[PDB]
């Protein structure tokens, strides 16, 4: 398939379509956003999707509307995996550079990449060479330095995810999101909290669990957070970003395939409802093939191909509504404009945070983590 | 009913793919139901649908196959009638629904929230609605249900208004677990209490102090997450950490804003915690003696609803049962192998990567008075 | 519209002496003479000002600790259908001048009613625009503003507002804030007991307070605030007592027919029982809201809410009490007291000496447990 | 009688409002008393007044109407007379009062504190005052009263000095509940012991170790809060948490400082715990053989008093009965519906919001040696 939304509108009477969209997405028909004519042109020529949507809030008496625009960019790797790693990184750089420009002309304020956007998702091979040389410094690394310039020039916050080598702490590798301010200056980094070891995603071979905690970045365009890939699955992770005051939480990821796809429209969505903030799940696209054969921990014979990464990036709102997805197979830039005020508004109406009883759960979790833990199971007497 | 509508509008090969993304599988794993059970359903005018979840065959463990029956219904006689007559009409309706679940071979049967009464909390009147509250162990509904449990050899879980005698005659929102021996297993009180809109439940009862209990029955480790607690992922999480395998979600929700969240919340919980999830919801629209306002700008009214039914079951691997009807009484019978839980936990490894010690610490800090969020500013 | 004035208007002076003895604490009120200029402000702006005095016995080892408190009851000012900032500002300006009169009357501690900054909008159960009244505890406009009058008049100011907590998920709370006479923010305390009875749907807006039972050590005594519904829980008043309180203010907002006879009772007992001073303050007038609401009774929907019956007073540890202010007029109650009366009563009556708290600590633990079996004795 | 004074000086429409604020209602809900009862009271020269409290009609519960008789009296023969003759005189006076209560159709009758003796504790003499102390179960007063209980089919609660034989012949201040069957139900010992002024009760007995018992009689769950315990709201509260519906408060207080507290303390308890309260007080002034001092600066005297009577009943909804006389023997007969308890519990929800776990913990902390009060200072 290509885009579920397009499929549903190509097969259903308009009034039933209205209802199906009401239950699947948040609204009755898409709140489209009209995009600058010059931006659509960049996208058409370079052959990538550009779609615009709008979320709104109610008008407040003591607070002016806080309208902000985000650009989520999904892409594939560009030149064959058997080519100097520097050339690989540079091809992706130049593709995305043009996508960041379209986002800029579409008037975005925060732009964000997928997970390990800088490289083919090489962790399936479990080879250290030459794949580790993709790992750069978080602050002074080429990609950050480069990206920092487009940030200053377009006056927009850029969040991106790369392999990080930490020099000071024993040259160790980490999976890191870095937030670049609209001033051009490096704001900080956050390391992936939850590390996958399921199947082809042998990420536990390359780096340990993140020790950056759950930081929220206060930029001039909202309090932003990044929940990296597999951390998608841990609702207690999403929750902690919430407790630290996040308003948009980006979810850069990289997932194939049959079992993982139905979870896509569920996990990110729930987090947005539950913590009452915005959610931006971004996913890699295309399928990638590697030099030597590998096995995936199933019974299967060894192969070289990895994929297909199913794209389908979207944005989830705190009130339960959500943007249609982008393509499953085609590069794309998702531009969505939102009013940050909807966060507090929903928090006040549904009162999820008023009823969390976090002290109770902090105590119950501490008990459960202890050695002598005896579960609260009631048996028949 | 969404599943029926998608099959009535899409080419079979594309419907295969849309079902793959929306539900867990490419075409529903139907269960064939005993001929006599569909009969009772037919006659009494309620839906009966059967589905099957399966697990991989294990070397060291026999397949633990179990059958659950989720029962959604409406109230039955007008809200303006002796409260005992009201409870008894719903009693008799559901009595025969539990019988059809029995003949369909269920082992655990479960009700919606406050299944014994019109959801009268929208009026915020204490009279005569508080008289629906009974005792958890010796209350008429538990006593009566306890006999069907012994007779049909099945665990029955149900949700009622509870009056606690010993603790100052206070009211609570409680699910009661009745063992298939007939004997009362225990109760669990609603952890998270809503105050949004028409759902003025904070007016009738406090937050539950039963913790997060899991009941070891011979048909699995079961737990009940009541209604609004649906929205709290740390809630589902804790039943998980206590070793749950099927967590029922009895509920009662109307409306335009609440309906899109239905297919989302209970589903994720099943994926996240790697266990089974049984969300059940009341059906029909109910109308009350005197006018009330809903906390919106609008004028006072007497009608409340419509409750949108749509009960389903979610599996630990991400798959899910189609929903029942949005407006018709229904019995959902689904058979599952409880081994799918550990199997998924082993393959995805969600529980091995939870880092609960860190979250236990992080949440303690956050709940403290001097809490300074981890916000990074530009220097 | 005032019980003291009514009883003095209908009874022979010798019988009135005895009726006052049993209803209030004394035989004839111990009036306080108020500065000429303060009564002036009151007269002009159309609000009551009444002064009374409580005294203690003189001690050998301790100087008289004489202190003056000013309780301010008022109504909202401009119609509820108007920019919420305008509404708060009108009440601001009215009360500003009332705190001035309290200042010239020589008060040292001034205190407001409950949610004094807003129409008591909780009866409608609407979140918009009423939640925008909620401000920060320390940096909120009302605290900032009041903090200046505190520095300038050299007086401790206690007030009650809707609080939005930023750090903890922008949640709303019902908070009393104590501002020191230095001008600096001393701290806050959140309403321990939350009502859900009738039109008072406060459970819809905020959870139970997690601040415990704080007592503020100011240079004018150890003060505490027991907010509104917490009025009804004697174990509440008790705990402020155990924490060493000497004056416990009770900012409140209550209508009506069932609630009124309880007014003279609850706050009074607490003063007797814990052997400290009690300052119950209540909103005044009746307020009406944009759209119709129902009150959880059988009755039809309405717009009007009230009437709030004012009637603020002070209760003393020895059982005596000030007359109340008016039932429907703005008022400033100025009462001067010797804080030594507290320990003196404690030593004569010995209530704290005989509390047996260990035993109640134990009994209450048992009662809160799941397996609780009441101590009921049946016939054999 | 303050009530009589207020109706003798105020225009009826203002009186209606003053009554509304002071008592619970706008004009007294009088009860019409049997003709024969008023007669016994007339002839023996004691007051008999009847009032009525009502509840709302319930669907699932029949009205639980019950009648209580509170009896206030004075000592009757001079303190300088064989103690047995003294007790006997009071016996014979009250015996006829219990009879009037019986004909007025009372179901529960109750005495004041140490009803059996002049309140001799002011002298601090052990002789002959200690010989007034009898056994709880086998004591002459209990035995005799138990007969009238069987014969009139009414629960009798009374307060005496108790000598405990088994535990070292020690003296206690005890309320004894005698069932309407005639059989001894149990006893409860005064929890809080006064040492203020003339009330040197700590000289005669220690603190009660019977806890906070509630007696399940067929006319309600009853409790007795003795005298000084009237001042401890935590005491009242515990009887509430043990499920009481009527709590009697037998007392003996004089004086100028103590009287304004009378219409406050017992009243609050009833609103706070949402049950019925019956404070009873001794009447008249009593004179003793030898001079004593009262712990003030004053010279020694022989007279003690005056005890100010003024017994009444407090309802859970905030309403209350007028008082009896300040100086005259009296029987207060009041009929109430016990259902008003739960009804008000439901509406005001005091018990639902008590947060007992919190206060159980806070009180434990406070009682400990290392206790640092929660005092906030300026930084």
Automatic annotation (TrEMBL), chains B, D:
GO terms for molecular function: beta-ureidopropionase activity. Pathway: Amino-acid biosynthesis; beta-alanine biosynthesis. Keywords: Hydrolase. InterPro entries: Aliph_Amidase/BUP, C-N_Hydrolase, C-N_Hydrolase_sf. Residues 66-338 form the CN hydrolase domain. Its EC number is 3.5.1.6. GO terms for cellular component: cytoplasm. It comes from the Eukaryota. GO terms for biological process: 'de novo' pyrimidine nucleobase biosynthetic process; beta-alanine biosynthetic process via 3-ureidopropionate; pyrimidine nucleobase catabolic process. It catalyses: 3-(carbamoylamino)-2-methylpropanoate + H2O + 2 H(+) = (R)-3-amino-2-methylpropanoate + NH4(+) + CO2; 3-(carbamoylamino)propanoate + H2O + 2 H(+) = beta-alanine + NH4(+) + CO2. The keyword Hydrolase applies. It is an enzyme of class 3 (hydrolase). Belongs to the carbon-nitrogen hydrolase superfamily. BUP family. This is Beta-ureidopropionase. It comes from Drosophila melanogaster (Fruit fly).
From TrEMBL, chain C:
It is an enzyme of class 3 (hydrolase). The keyword Kinase does not apply. Keywords: Hydrolase. Its EC number is 3.5.1.6. SUPFAM superfamilies: Carbon-nitrogen hydrolase. InterPro entries: Aliph_Amidase/BUP, C-N_Hydrolase, C-N_Hydrolase_sf. The keyword Hydrolase applies. Pathway: Amino-acid biosynthesis; beta-alanine biosynthesis. Belongs to the carbon-nitrogen hydrolase superfamily. BUP family. This is Beta-ureidopropionase. It comes from Drosophila melanogaster (Fruit fly). The lineage of its organism: Eukaryota, Metazoa, Ecdysozoa, Arthropoda, Hexapoda.
């Amino acid at each position: 398939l290509k885009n579920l939304n397009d499929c549903l509108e190509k097969h259903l009477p308009p009034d039933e379509l209205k209802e199906v969209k009401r239950i699947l997405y948040g609204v009755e028909e898409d709140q489209t956003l009209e995009l600058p004519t010059s931006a659509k042109d960049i996208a058409e020529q370079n052959g990538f999707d550009i779609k615009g949507y709008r979320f709104t809030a109610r008008e407040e008496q003591t607070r002016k509307r806080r309208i902000v625009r985000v650009g989520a960019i999904q892409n594939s790797i560009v030149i064959p995996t058997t080519a100097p790693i520097e050339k690989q990184r540079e091809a992706i750089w130049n593709k995305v550079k043009t996508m960041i420009k379209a986002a800029a002309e579409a008037g975005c304020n925060i732009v964000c990449t997928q997970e390990a956007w800088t490289m083919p998702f090489a962790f399936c091979t479990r080879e250290k060479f030459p794949w580790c040389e993709f790992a750069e410094e978080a602050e002074n690394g080429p990609t950050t330095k480069m990206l920092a310039e487009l940030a200053k020039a377009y006056n927009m916050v850029i969040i991106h995810s790369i392999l990080e080598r930490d020099m000071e702490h024993g040259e160790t590798i980490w999976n890191t999101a870095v937030v670049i301010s609209n001033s051009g200056r490096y704001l900080g980094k956050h390391r992936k909290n939850h590390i996958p070891r399921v199947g082809d995603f042998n990420e536990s071979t390359y780096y340990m669990e993140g020790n950056t905690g759950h930081p929220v970045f206060e930029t001039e365009f909202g309090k932003l957070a990044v929940n990296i890939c597999y951390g998608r699955h841990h609702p207690q992770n999403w929750m902690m970003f919430g407790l630290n005051g996040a308003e948009i939480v980006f979810n850069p990821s990289a997932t194939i395939g049959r079992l993982s796809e139905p979870l896509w429209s569920i996990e990110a969505r729930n987090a947005a409802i539950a913590n009452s903030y915005f959610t931006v799940p971004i996913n890699r696209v295309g399928t990638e093939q590697f030099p030597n054969e590998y096995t995936s921990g199933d019974g299967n014979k060894a192969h070289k191909e990895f994929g297909p990464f199913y794209g389908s990036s979207y944005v989830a709102a705190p009130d339960g509504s959500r943007t249609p997805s982008l393509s499953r197979d085609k590069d794309g830039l998702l531009v969505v404009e939102l009013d940050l005020n909807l966060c507090r508004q929903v928090k006040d109406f549904w009162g999820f945070r008023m009823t969390q009883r976090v002290p109770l759960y902090a105590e119950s979790f501490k008990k459960a983590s202890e050695h002598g833990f005896k579960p609260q199971i009631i048996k028949e007497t």
